[PDB]
Design a protein around this ligand. Structure first.
Ligand SMILES: C=C1[C@H](O)CC(=C/C=C2\CCC[C@]3(C)[C@@H]([C@H](C)[C@@H](CCCC)CCC(C)(C)O)CC[C@@H]23)C[C@H]1O
Lengths: 240, 11
């Protein structure tokens, strides 16, 4: 029993994702070129890809019903904390179980564990990242579920530095109710069973990955030489 | 708070 509002919410989140996610990956040609030889050799390319993906996530977020009613400061706090997580989430669409890699339509734009290693991150982060991708991919989400999960991740009350937790919660709640009802009404067994609880668990996994990223990012970024390889938006969003 | 780029992209 999907309300008219709920069907509305889904239609908006699908369009917003379509407008901010190009399944052809055409823009990837504008990044500094990938290099798979030295140490940090994929960093310039992958920082570009991250920076781009931050812009696209910001453009998705702005379309989330209710998001615009938040304060500018709270919008900032939510994006800054969720950015890496949504990039992780949104990355699942290019992630392929065959190769255990992210496949962006080209050999040059196909990323594996070793490429991520060339970004300067350890296996301590990379291993759980790939495991995350595998478990998320196995959920086999409908695109409606996927777009809802992204929006729910962005509008989390439980983010440090939030001013209006209560308004953020009421925005999320309406997305959570929309998702729950969608799974029940639009999702067929067996795919649907405990699907919500598993989607909720991925949000928890993302938080742990986010913690580990911030740590390795401080280590990477702490050196000025490495920091120079990043983009101005990546430095503003992640830190410096 | 020191986020000019993010703020500009948001609106
Ligand atoms: C458009 C898409 C496509 O689906 C392609 C995408 C792939 C995402 C990938 C694959 C390459 C490695 C990426 C960029 C990861 C980064 C290198 C990331 C590794 C640690 C993960 C927590 C480190 C980023 C920095 C800034 C260097 O700390 C995050 C998402 C990963 C992202 C998405 O925006």
């Amino acid at each position: 029993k999907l309300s008219e509002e709920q069907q509305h919410i889904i239609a908006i989140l699908l369009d917003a994702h379509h407008k901010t996610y190009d399944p052809t990956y055409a823009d990837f040609r504008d990044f500094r070129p990938p290099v798979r030889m030295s140490p940090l050799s994929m960093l310039p390319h992958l920082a570009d890809l991250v920076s781009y993906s931050i812009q696209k996530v910001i453009g998705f977020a702005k379309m989330i019903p209710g998001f615009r009613d938040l304060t500018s400061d709270d919008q900032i706090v939510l994006l800054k904390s969720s950015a890496i997580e949504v990039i992780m989430l949104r990355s699942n669409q290019s992630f392929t179980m065959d190769d255990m890699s992210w496949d962006c339509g080209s050999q040059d734009y196909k990323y594996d564990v070793t490429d991520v290693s060339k970004a300067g991150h350890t296996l301590e982060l990379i291993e759980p990242l790939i495991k995350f991708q595998v478990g998320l991919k196995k959920l086999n989400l409908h695109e409606e579920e996927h777009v809802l999960l992204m929006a729910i991740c962005i509008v989390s009350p439980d983010r440090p530095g939030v001013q209006d937790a209560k308004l953020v919660e009421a925005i999320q709640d309406r997305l959570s109710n929309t998702l729950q009802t969608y799974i029940r009404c639009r999702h067929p067994p067996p795919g649907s069973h405990q699907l919500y609880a598993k989607m909720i668990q991925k949000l928890a996994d993302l938080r742990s990955l986010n913690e580990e990223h911030s740590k390795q990012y401080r280590s990477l970024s702490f050196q000025p030489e490495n920091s120079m390889k990043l983009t101005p938006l990546v430095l503003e969003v992640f830190g410096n | 708070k020191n986020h000019p780029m993010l703020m500009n992209l948001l609106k």
